[PDB]
Amino acid sequence: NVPKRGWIAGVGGCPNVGGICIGCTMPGFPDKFMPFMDAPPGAVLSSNLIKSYGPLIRSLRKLTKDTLNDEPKWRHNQPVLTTGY
């Protein structure tokens, strides 16, 4: 739970901070994880997994974000109130 909780005062961690998780809390440690800097064989399948939907969902998110980066029209210094009141 290190990443979810941090190391000390929420300050540290491993992957959430740039450190590969080497499985140091598991019965299989360390032998079933070495070499540590190699990709887990199961990960290559999931990293070579194909998300054709990967670029779409990102493009849709950006659009939605852009409209959220636009204040409503009724916020101005014009002498006539547009807020609907």
By three-state DSSP, how is residue 58 classified? helix
Q: Looking at this protein, which amino acid is placed at residue 85? A: Y
Q: Which does 56 bind (CB under 5 to 8 A by kind): ligand SF4, a second copy, none?
A: a second copy
Q: Does residue 47 interact with a second copy by CB under 8 A?
A: no
For residues 33 and 29, give the distance between their C-alpha atoms in angstroms, rounded to a whole number: 6
Q: Which does 84 bind (CB under 5 to 8 A by kind): a second copy, ligand SF4, none?
A: none
Cα within 13 Å of Cα(22), Cβ side: 10
Binding mask 7-46 for a second copy (x = CB under 8 A): --xxx-----------x--xxxx-xxx------xxx--xx
